[PDB]
Amino acid sequence: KTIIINGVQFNTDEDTTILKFARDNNIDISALCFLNNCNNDINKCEICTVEVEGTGLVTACDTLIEDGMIINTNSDAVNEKIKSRISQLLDIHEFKCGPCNRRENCEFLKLVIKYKARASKPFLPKDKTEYVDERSKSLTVDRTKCLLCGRCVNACGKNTETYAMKFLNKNGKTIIGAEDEKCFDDTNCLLCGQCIIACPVAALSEKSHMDRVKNALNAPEKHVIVAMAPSVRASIGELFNMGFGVDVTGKIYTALRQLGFDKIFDINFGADMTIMEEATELVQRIENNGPFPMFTSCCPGWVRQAENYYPELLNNLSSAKSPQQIFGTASKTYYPSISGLDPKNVFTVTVMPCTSKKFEADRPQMEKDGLRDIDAVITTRELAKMIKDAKIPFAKLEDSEADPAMGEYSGAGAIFGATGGVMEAALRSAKDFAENAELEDIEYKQVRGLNGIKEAEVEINNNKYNVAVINGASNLFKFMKSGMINEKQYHFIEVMACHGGCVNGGGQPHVNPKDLEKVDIKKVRASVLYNQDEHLSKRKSHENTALVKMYQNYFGKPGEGRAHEILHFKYKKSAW
Ligand code: SF4
Ligand code: SF4
Ligand code: SF4
Ligand code: SF4
Ligand code: FES
Ligand SMILES: [Mg+2]
Ligand SMILES: [Mg+2]
């Protein structure tokens, strides 16, 4: 194939699109609605317009290169078309970047600046109320920003296969929204936030908890704990121009203290708690021969998936609370027992890579004696905004340490944020528990990485067991519908709704499509976690010294008695 682009001849056997070929050859072509290898098939944005001689204007993102093509990407006709399409979007776009939560990394703004586009008539609604949907505990929509680019809808379909995000005809006008324009929470939506991650503008956002947090911080009598997810320390630096794959754990603890939090703990401590309980449960089921399989229950996207699509599995989920909720439960019981705080005055905040966690935290029964396990959840992005609003020079901060009583963690805990991490951590403990031993071979590499469905055979106490790690909500549907679950007897199955695990969650920093071509975001964020594991002296959850003291002095033996009564949560299917 001979191809001419802007007068440059290429000879190639490649079978690909003009966009991808141009991009591979450092020729600039803009794009908007193209993402995840899909464009918006109905109502194409045409931002990737180029000129093919003899044919006219074509969309480079979905037009294959052909031998003999002569292509101009930067002709006056091309730029005028693209400029026109951007101007048309400005006509339906509340272009007020100042207070906008995507001000610093918005794709549309870059395009507006690049083509010097202007609205015919500026879009300036006075009553945004009709345009905004904040009903959800997790997601919010601001349709004054929406480009109808279809990226949320394609990403929902690809990532989850639920198609909970849809195009809708609302009184004759096209919008995106949930089925029947219901609140997302009241539909089959997993509240995973992959739609947000796909959004080029500030149209989709997380449901804010930042005022819950600020109010508690400013309330004189409130004692505000904060505790961040595994993934936050591998990710948040991205929003402070520190690049990718930077471990900023120490800087976060310092930042959190500068924001005025009263105690700095860590959700990885809660991940060790979850393993203590989950691994103990796994050994129990093995001894009662069932029910099998046991599924993890720590991902609320998956819990919602089970609730909405496989309620028959709800009884197979581990009764262990998730690291978030189990930590929170302890934060209102154990923590007062070792601090003297009145439990009513403890306000527990988590920092998560996740939008679904907001919903988990607000489940009615996720409380005891009137006290919420978790009072607020802020996403990685929300914490980055709080830090920037406070003029905290994050990239310049010195390292500090967590408060150890609910802040220590093992390397088992540290890897939770990657797909296969829970499985690996859980097996490090279950094997030790079952064989009553302290084994030295603790790396389960076969359950790691980005394959959609991963399985392994493991030997526990001289019997074989089958494990699977389901990596992404769409892969959970594949596993079930294809009958894979019936090819053999599965004993323990991990499910994460987000592909890559929590490091790719819905609350994470946006990465623009070009950086994504350049960096494997799932692997690079995950690598921070595995590195921590490798350098920690304690690499099993049950060797966490602070955790051991808590169980010895307060909860007693895992998986029974007081531990079972307050650290566990069971989901029930509705009756016939
Ligand atoms: S979505 Fe982007 S272009 Fe629109 S107001 Fe916000 S920052 Fe500006
Ligand atoms: S919400 Fe965002 S991703 Fe979805 S159509 Fe609107 S601008 Fe595109
Ligand atoms: S939160 Fe997840 S399941 Fe719900 S619409 Fe967005 S991508 Fe789809
Ligand atoms: S994989 Fe992690 S970030 Fe994604 S929905 Fe589940 S808990 Fe949330
Ligand atoms: S980027 Fe090609 S039509 Fe939208
Ligand atoms: Mg297409
Ligand atoms: Mg305070």
Curated annotation (Swiss-Prot):
Q: Where does [2Fe-2S] cluster bind?
A: 33, 45, 48, 61
State the InterPro entries in the record: 2Fe-2S_ferredoxin-like_sf (IPR036010), 2Fe-2S_ferredoxin-type (IPR001041), 4Fe4S_Fe-S-bd (IPR017896), 4Fe4S_Fe_S_CS (IPR017900), Cytosolic_Fe-S_CAF (IPR050340), Fe_hydrogenase (IPR009016), Fe_hydrogenase_lsu_C (IPR004108), Fe_hydrogenase_ssu (IPR003149)
Give the enzyme class. oxidoreductase
Domain (4Fe-4S ferredoxin-type): residue spans on this chain:
137-166, 180-209
Keywords, A to Z?
A: 4Fe-4S, Iron, Iron-sulfur, Metal-binding, Oxidoreductase, Repeat
Instruction: Give any GO molecular function from the UniProt entry.
Output: ferredoxin hydrogenase activity
Q: Which residues bind [4Fe-4S] cluster 3?
A: 156, 189, 192, 195
Q: For the 2Fe-2S ferredoxin-type domain, which residue ranges apply?
A: 1-77
Q: Which residues bind [4Fe-4S] cluster 2?
A: 146, 149, 152, 199
Which residues of the sequence carry a binding annotation for [4Fe-4S] cluster 1? 93, 97, 100, 106
Provide the protein name.
Answer: Iron hydrogenase 1
User: What is the source species?
Assistant: Clostridium pasteurianum
